[PDB]
Structures are given as structure tokens and as C-alpha cells.
Design an enzyme around this catalytic site. Sequence first.
Site, PDB file in Angstrom:
ATOM      1  N   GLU A  23       4.522   5.430   7.136  1.00 13.26           N
ATOM      2  CA  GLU A  23       5.806   4.345   7.072  1.00 13.26           C
ATOM      3  C   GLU A  23       5.669   3.316   7.828  1.00 13.26           C
ATOM      4  OE1 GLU A  23       8.224   7.501   8.263  1.00 13.26           O
ATOM      5  OE2 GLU A  23       9.253   7.625   6.325  1.00 13.26           O
ATOM      6  N   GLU A  61       6.695  13.119   2.261  1.00 14.39           N
ATOM      7  CA  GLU A  61       7.820  13.671   3.024  1.00 14.39           C
ATOM      8  C   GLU A  61       8.819  13.314   1.977  1.00 14.39           C
ATOM      9  OE1 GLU A  61       9.241  11.480   6.431  1.00 14.39           O
ATOM     10  OE2 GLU A  61       7.187  11.267   7.329  1.00 14.39           O
TER      11      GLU A  61
END
Lengths: 474, 474
Positions: free
Chosen positions: B166, B374
Site C-alpha cells: 500500500e 487483503e
Amino acid sequence: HLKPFPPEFLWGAASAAYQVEGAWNEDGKGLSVWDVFAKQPGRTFKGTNGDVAVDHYHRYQEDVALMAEMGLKAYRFSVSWSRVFPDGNGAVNEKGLDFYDRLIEELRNHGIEPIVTLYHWDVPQALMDAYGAWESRRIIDDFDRYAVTLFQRFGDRVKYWVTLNEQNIFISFGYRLGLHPPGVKDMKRMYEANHIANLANAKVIQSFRHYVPDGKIGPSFAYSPMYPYDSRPENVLAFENAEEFQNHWWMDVYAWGMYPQAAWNYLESQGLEPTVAPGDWELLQAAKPDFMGVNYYQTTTVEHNPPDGVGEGVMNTTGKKGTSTSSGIPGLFKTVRNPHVDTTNWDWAIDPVGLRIGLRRIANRYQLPILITENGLGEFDTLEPGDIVNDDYRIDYLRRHVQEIQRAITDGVDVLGYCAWSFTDLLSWLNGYQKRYGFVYVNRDDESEKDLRRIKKKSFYWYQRVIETNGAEL
Amino acid sequence: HLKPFPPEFLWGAASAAYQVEGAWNEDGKGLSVWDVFAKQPGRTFKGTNGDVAVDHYHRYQEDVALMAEMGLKAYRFSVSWSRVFPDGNGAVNEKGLDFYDRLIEELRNHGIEPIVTLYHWDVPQALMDAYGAWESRRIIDDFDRYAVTLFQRFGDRVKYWVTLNEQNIFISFGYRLGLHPPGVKDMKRMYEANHIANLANAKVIQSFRHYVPDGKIGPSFAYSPMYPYDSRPENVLAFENAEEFQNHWWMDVYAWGMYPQAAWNYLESQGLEPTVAPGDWELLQAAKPDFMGVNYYQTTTVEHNPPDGVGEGVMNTTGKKGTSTSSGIPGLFKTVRNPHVDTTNWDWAIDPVGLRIGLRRIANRYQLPILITENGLGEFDTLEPGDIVNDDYRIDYLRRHVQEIQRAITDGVDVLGYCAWSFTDLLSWLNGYQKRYGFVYVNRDDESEKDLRRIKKKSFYWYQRVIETNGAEL
Ligand SMILES: O=P(O)(O)OC[C@H]1O[C@@H](O)[C@H](O)[C@@H](O)[C@@H]1O
Ligand SMILES: O=P(O)(O)OC[C@H]1O[C@@H](O)[C@H](O)[C@@H](O)[C@@H]1O
């Protein structure tokens, strides 16, 4: 603060040979698939056909002087294959080449850049007769012979070329909807003919690199950018399927040499994917174009469409507003009226910002320069006494599209030029003559040729000012 | 008719070191920016921090036993760079490696595929002190030496690697919003650091080709697919700007080695664009990943934002459904609540179809395999008598997301694996512990640390069944 239109920006206008030339059986010309189709009863509005059209074949000198008076920087036209090879693949009709030579010479002597389109839907009938034209691989080499014939004869005077003009239309109208020749309604045959056209396109781009090393070439895609009706996730998903199936299906091949995977798998699941030969992918991937040509008129809005849902819809060939209905592919998407835009009387949306959106998508997805090869507005024009045509409605549409193009340029899209559709009024493939697009009105209708006189509309003088100021005054 | 999940689909679960390990200063561990930042008063909810967290450093054997019990095929975790190099670039801490050695062995011994994330937001404070960490090109070779150390030591046992997790979040939260270390609100700095992180990613992917030739690697992007609010053209344009600016800005760099032109230009116009050196583009273009990691939780709906309108907006830390407000970039877009989906109490959208759209966009744009690194639902869990946590809410969210994945695979997307977030409840970076994501409840709250005992939630057994039936039973 807007970027200016660049200094060599090709301010243009356009036509297509069947729509404009006439002289359908003169000077050795063979029959095209369109000479034959438009004469089948019921195919075209009021029996209208291209026998005479607006007689540009005889009157090109007058039309070129009008272009010179408007100050046109470029003129995009197509070459009628059946004038150059009457039987498609035999011996060349020198008289047919000589007309395009005289045309090009007339353009150059008034300082207008010719943009040559190789194919605007008029494959010779004798190729349809011998092997089914775009459905057979034989066409790859026949189209290549024809293209190279043009490259050699005109490559030293023409820098800008378009290969297949709106392959998505002539293929789907010809083989899925049955509305164009050869009038087939068979999806399997559609995708096979499409694959063959992809190959022919790449083949000629490849020959072009040899014969016209300093030229620039690309296909021209009929691009209606898709929108989702709203933020409902299934409507967004329908958007993804619509953009992929209607737009990426062609443009990814043109840019990357590859069909997109989800549409391919949907076709394969239905037994509809094309037959692929050894060497196909290699040809398609090794023929990068210099630009993506874009024909833009409108965007399309879509929503969810369940598997028992909508298929073909009603088209509008009349001009009564509100008569079109939804189209789609069951399970993937269907169209819906976009409530946030006006439409013309033929139900085409007026969506200048959509042009900005489509230009931004093509740059973002392919990083390619774009030549806008067609954009215009078709409406009834009234000829008022004193040879006067006030087409404010057309100016208003052109103005707003050209403004959004400037916005796209400022955003960073490399736009090489803009060809309004059309220079003179011309024949609509199906809709006859009354749906006019020209800067120059042509005095005829669906029933009489009259004198075919050319009459400058108000939009003529508007575009003339756009060009003189390189776009600063709209 | 759905395709099934492939036979070695990596049914997974995931964590991140800071969020889970504790042992923040044991066995030679150096400080990370998060060790320092979380201790700054008022940064985190009720001063919660990761000195202990859920004490996975000491409890890993129990944690892996529970994973084997569930039948997990894979477990994704991060390595804490400060355990391995306490100073970031000095000598290696063998006891740090040793922990990850023990954890990997423990996972293999139970037939669980380990997925190693190189970077989850915990760069050693010494590197921030020595030279500004991500704002300096020095971090590139330092990050590389760290990654190569891991590659050499665990290469033979780990097939799947994620590089930066991320990036868009640690960059943006760290340098634009000031919510994460280094606590900056400065776009010029954001984009400089962003650029350096891009190069770091590419450098270690290159190193990986040398050191782990049969392995698979990619970055993992926090992906919120954008939607336009409606079919107003100005709204669809705002969607084009948002998806390009928020999403393609990162993904096109990971996939194709280049930034999107329009976003670049807009940056350039604000003086915000990164500094480029000779060789940057060659390196970025030369670092093609095997897959794209995708962390997905929600989509975002956007609308037109005028030049004067919304910038930074109110985030939702509290849990009061309704408190978020539109965020945007003036001139380009701003967010707006999507009326067609539900939200959690933190105003996160529940939009499983969004995940299929997201996976379809990445395949359509990049043709890459995807590894969902995720996905998960955060909520308050009650522990009820008899060691019962009835997390139906959580089962419902995960089920719908897994269904939509199956649909994506049926569409033709190549999904390698799915990692639910998270295996055990863990520490939220800012929000403490009460917002739980785990299959396994951990007995602690924001006040009382209690005993940190693991209790299997209902979801644990739900997901047990999912894995047992390779996804047929949901
Ligand atoms: O509005 P119409 O009359 O059906 O025509 C559409 C026009 O636009 C494009 O579809 C074609 O390239 C043109 O050849 C045609 O003239
Ligand atoms: O603030 P929340 O609701 O705890 O969500 C944060 C989660 O969101 C993700 O963005 C992070 O990768 C996770 O590390 C984290 O657990």
C-alpha cells in the site's frame, strides 16, 4: 488557461467516395458492394443510391475551390477501390487512378493537405462474388495489392493515411445487423470477418513502413465512449462490459495487437470467437499505427441487462424524435437514454464533453496521438430565398466540440487535427439526402438531382474564421 | 454457470509486523518510525501502540497451530526491517532473521505457503534520522540490501513475495495528510518520496530476478475502484480524473513503468511533479511484476468538483455512521456518498461487486494475474459466554466478496489467491483494538491488556469450511 491549437494542426473536413462521387459506372469503374446493395428494393430510404450522389467526380474542381475559399488545411476523402481495380484484384484502371491524381494535384495546388482513406465500405463486388470479400483471407493480399498501388502512386504527395474507416460499423452492420452488405445476421461470421479485417489492417500498415517511410498511418475507429447510468455497482459493471466489448475489442487490437480477455472468453463460451491461424498474433502485434483515428458523434449510456433481457433495438432512420429503443447484449449491458444530455432528432446524443472523455481514454489507455477523422451534426437544412442557409444548430454543435478538443489538448492529449463531417452535403448510406451534414449545401433531394448547385451555409463562414484564427475565435 | 476456484488457489489470511508482533525492543530490534510516532501524544486512539500489540513474536507457534487447524493454504505477513537491520543499513541482526526463519519453518512444517511482504510502513527511525528515509535516493540501495538479505536467506523456501504494501497509503498518509510518519502535509514532498518508492520497488524486483528466479513477486496496491456518480458528462470526466489520479498513478508505474500523462501534466502545472534523473525510466520500465497485489475494502463514487470546491475532508475515526465528508481535488473530482450501497459504521462502503469490477479493470488494463492480499471487515465483536464470538456480519461480508471473486475468475481474470484480513485480531495503526478484523479473537481491549488469549470466532469455522470445499461451499 488553454493550450493553443498547435501550429501545424490539420483543420480539415471529410467525405467518403460512395457518398459523394457519383460516376458509378464511368471511366472503367467496376461495381462495388454498395452499387449492388443500394439497388435492392427496400435497402435504402426511398430507393436512394450513389449513382450520382452529389457528382463530386465531375465537380471536384468547384469543390476544391470552395475548400480553398474556406481556407481548409486538410481534406480527407476515400479512394473507391472499384475505380482502381474494377474486378478488385485484376488489372488496374489507370483512368481510376488518374482521377485521384487530378484530385490530389488540385488540392496541393491550393495548399490543402490530402488525407487518404483506403477503405470506406465499398469493396468491389467481384471480390464478394469470388470469395465472400471480408469473410475470406484472400482479401488480406488483395487489399494489400490495392493499398501498395496507392502508396506507390501517391506516397510522395500524401503524408497522412487512414486504413479501415470504422471497421466496427461496416463489419457489424454487414454481418450482425444485416443493414449493410452483404446483409448477413450471423455473429459467428461477424467475428470471423472482423478478424480478417484486423489482419488486413496490419498487413497494410506493415507494407506502408516500406513504401512510405515518412508517412503517418492509422485506422479510424467509430468511437462512442460508454458511460454507466449511475453508481449502482451492476450498472458500473455493465459499463465495464460495454466499453470492453464495443470499444476495446477493436482499439486494443489496433494499438496492442490483442483482444481483451473477458470479451474473448464470453465469445468462446458461445462458440463465437474467431479462427486464429499460426502467425496471426505476430502480424497483429507488429503493426503499430502512428495515430488512432477517431470518428465521434456521441456517447452511449448503459445499465444492467439480465440474461433474458434486451437484444437488438429499434434504430431511427426517420427523424421523428423519441423513436429509438434500447439495444444490448443479454447478460452484459443495454443502452439507456442519458437524461443529462440533449439528442438530435435522430436520437443521437449531443455530448461535446464526451469527446474530451474519449480523447482522454485513448491517450490514457494507449498513449497514442489522435486524428479526429469525423465529427459533425446531421439535420434538415432549409434553403431560404437568395441562396441562404442559416445552420446555427450546426455551428453550435461544432463550436462546443472544438472547445472540448482544446480542453483535451490542454490536458495533454496529442491531437493532430480535426475533420468535420462533412465538406458538402452528401448521400447517407440508408437515410437519403435530407439529413445533411455539409458546410456546403448541395441543391438536390431524395427525388431530384436538380442542378446540384453548391451553396455555402452559415457554418462555412464560421469554420473559415475558426481556421483563420487557428481556433482562438470560436 | 460459475467456474470453480482453481485447484491450488491460495486461500490465505494476512497480517503486518507492527500490527501483530510486539517485542518492539527484544533481541536487538532497532526503533521504527512507528515505534516513535505512536508514542507521540494524541496520535493514536487512547495512546495505543505496538510495544506488545497481540504478542505474536512470542506466541507465533500457537498462532500457526490455529492456522493449520483452519486449513490455511497461505499466510501473508510482513518482515520488520528494524528487526533485521536495527540501523537500516549497518550490520545484520541474526536474531531478527532467526525469528522469521523460525516462523517460516513453523509454517512449512504445517504445509502452509508463506507470503512475505517486504515493507509494511515500518522503516527504521535511523534512516529517517540519517537522511529523510523515503525522501532520499539512498533508501533505494538500503532497501535493496535489506530485500536481498531476505531473498538469500528465505529464497529457497518462499515462492510468493510482495514488495511495497500500500505505497499509496504510506506515502499519502505520511506526506500529504500527516496522519502517519513522518507526519508531513506537503504535496511536493509526497510526490518526491512517491517517486523514490517507485524506484525502490523496481530495484528490488530486478534483484529478485537474479536471486529468486523461480519465485513470484509484485507490489500490492490499496485499490478503491472509482465510480462516477451518474451519467452527467462532467461526472464521468471527474471519474476519469479520479481513477487516473488515485489509481493509475500507481498501477501504471508498477505495470508499465510510466506515469499517466494527464496527471503528470496537472502536477507539472502546480510545480508538484517529481524530479527525474537519467536512468529512472529505464529502471521503472524494466521491472515487470508477476502479479499485482490488491488490497481491497471498498469503492469510491465521485462527482464534478469546481476550482474553488472541496480539498481535504473529514475522515471517520469514531464509528458514527454519517460523520465522513467529501474529500477532493479542486477542479478534478470530489467524493460523494454512493446511495446504491451500504456502509460500515466507519463509513466504509460494502460493495462486493466493486471487487469484481476492480479485478476486471486490472486484467483489462494490464493483463496481470492478481493476488488479493487483503480484504476484510472491521467491527466490534462481543465475546459471549462459552467462548463464543458470533461474527455473522463478518461472515456475510467475506462470503459476498469471495462469490464476486468466483465471478471474476469465471469472467477470465487470473486470481492467484485470496488473503483475508486478518488472521487474529490486531492493532489498528490509529484506532486501537476494538475495531476487529480477525478470524481469531484476541482477548484485549484499549484499556486492559488482559491475557491476549486467542478465541476462535464463528468466521474462523465458516472459513474453515470454505477452504475444505475449495470454495464450493460458502
Ligand atoms: O447520420 P447518418 O446519415 O446515418 O450517417 C452517419 C455518418 O457517420 C459515420 O457513421 C460514417 O462514417 C459516415 O459515412 C456517415 O455519413
Ligand atoms: O483503521 P482500520 O479500520 O483499523 O483499518 C486499517 C486497516 O486498513 C488497511 O488499509 C491496512 O493495510 C491495514 O493494516 C489495517 O488493519
